[PDB]
């Protein structure tokens, strides 16, 4: 007989997939479309999720009830120290898909980069790229030969960047290496830009801007083996049920005698690669700038790092991207910020945002003071003081 009562299914079968990801650094399966009338620019950037805070800004949306009125909005801050280009890579069109034919590196790689190719770095003789720098030894011949090999072939051109993790307060000395596809200009001009940026850094304010809508690719915060009531969102069985209630009751029909793939079944929750599109950039902040959390309306000299630091992260001292809303991944995680693949023009975008206030009270509790000067101005002199 039939269901007797229709309901939408619990779960999404296009993310049916629920296993652990391959790494903490989630892959970008699609870079933005190439328009070769533009200058050369990176299509994504690598950052680290610090945590969340709260913004107050005015709304510009004519026709709404909160038009010209202050709203508060949760944002994510990602610490983005300036990424640094160490290689370039060419990919040729085949009838079987894009194929990397050549990968050229720079002459000097930092220990952050070298440390990525090692599982036991302290025991090593540290021999990585030692014979490769000999190609730069004799006058740069073979390097320009493989560069011309890229220039002839290689319909798309990617660039091997890596993060400066020593500027980021984690205990993780081993940096992350990634391929970001350049877009604008010719294949020649692409690899010219790539060669001219070997060992030099690219900052985030050359890749993004104010009011841009960006996608965030990351790995979801993991939780372990999880039952079906939380991993799938199934109704709990009633109080009288023998043998358990956080289950799925019927696993399938008698015909066929197999469990179907589409039924809700327990397993891993979290640590999935997820891409979330259309997040608006609210602030591109500078590390060589105190009063980062200041505002044209606020004008108190304060950085975005709240009282007692970002909890479980540390202290932001570099350039950062402050982006509206929730981002996949927890704090400390490597996060790829990609430009949007399609021109989002649906009037939630193209709104020129302008903040009014940035919350820097302590997220380690009910933080009530934005600055230590304000805390002292409220409380006065204490037993520890002067």
């Amino acid at each position: 007989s039939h269901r007797k009562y229709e309901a939408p299914r619990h779960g999404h079968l296009g993310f049916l997939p629920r296993k652990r990801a391959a790494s903490i650094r989630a892959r970008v399966k699609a870079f933005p479309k190439d328009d070769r009338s533009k200058p050369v620019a990176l299509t994504s950037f690598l950052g680290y999720k610090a945590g969340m805070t709260t913004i107050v800004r005015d709304l510009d949306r004519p026709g709404s009830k909160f038009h010209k009125r202050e709203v508060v909005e949760a944002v994510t801050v990602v610490d983005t120290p300036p990424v640094v280009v160490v290689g370039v890579v060419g990919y040729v069109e085949t009838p079987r898909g894009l194929r990397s034919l050549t990968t050229v590196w720079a002459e000097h790689l930092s220990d952050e980069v070298k440390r990525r190719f090692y599982k036991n770095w302290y025991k090593s003789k540290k021999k990585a790229f030692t014979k490769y720098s000999a190609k730069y030894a004799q006058d740069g011949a073979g390097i320009e030969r493989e560069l011309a090999r890229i220039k002839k072939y290689a319909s798309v051109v990617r660039v091997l960047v890596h993060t400066q993790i020593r500027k980021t307060p984690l205990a993780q000395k081993k940096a992350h290496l990634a391929e970001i596809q350049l877009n604008g200009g010719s294949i020649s001009e692409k690899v010219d830009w790539a060669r001219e940026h070997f060992e030099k850094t690219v900052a985030v304010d050359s890749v993004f801007e104010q009011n841009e809508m960006i996608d965030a690719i990351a790995v979801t915060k993991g939780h372990g083996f999880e039952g079906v009531t939380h991993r799938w969102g199934t109704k709990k069985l009633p109080r009288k049920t023998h043998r358990g209630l956080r289950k799925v009751a019927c696993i399938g029909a008698w015909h066929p005698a197999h469990v179907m793939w589409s039924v809700a079944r327990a397993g891993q929750r979290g640590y999935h690669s997820r891409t979330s599109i259309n997040h608006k950039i609210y602030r591109v902040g500078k590390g060589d700038d105190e009063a980062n959390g200041a505002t044209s309306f606020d004008r108190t000299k304060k950085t975005i790092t709240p009282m007692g630091g970002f909890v479980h992260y540390g202290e932001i001292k570099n350039d950062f991207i402050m982006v509206k809303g929730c981002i996949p991944g927890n704090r400390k995680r490597i996060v790829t910020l990609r430009k949007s693949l399609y021109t989002n023009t649906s009037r939630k975008a193209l709104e020129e945002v302008s903040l009014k206030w940035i919350d820097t009270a302590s997220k380690f509790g009910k933080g009530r003071f934005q600055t230590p000067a304000e805390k002292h101005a409220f409380m006065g002199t204490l037993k520890k003081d002067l």
Binding site: T54, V56, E70, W357, D359, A361, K366, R368
Partner: protein, 61 residues
């Protein structure tokens, strides 16, 4: 962007922080946290809670 003050304890209430509470006689109470909100719903006296502003005003602190 207005900084409001706590009805119970006199602490500053920054935007989007704490709760508000409208009584039956339309009297607005704004609380900074669930601590000062819970002490209000226990009908406690702010002048007898040692860390409130009204204590430190009455006791000349």
């Amino acid at each position: 962007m207005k900084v409001e003050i706590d009805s119970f304890s006199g602490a500053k209430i920054y935007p989007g922080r704490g709760t508000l509470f409208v009584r039956g006689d339309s009297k607005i109470f704004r609380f900074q946290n669930s601590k000062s909100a819970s002490l209000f719903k226990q009908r406690k006296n702010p002048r007898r809670i040692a860390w409130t502003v009204l204590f430190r005003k009455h006791h000349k602190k």
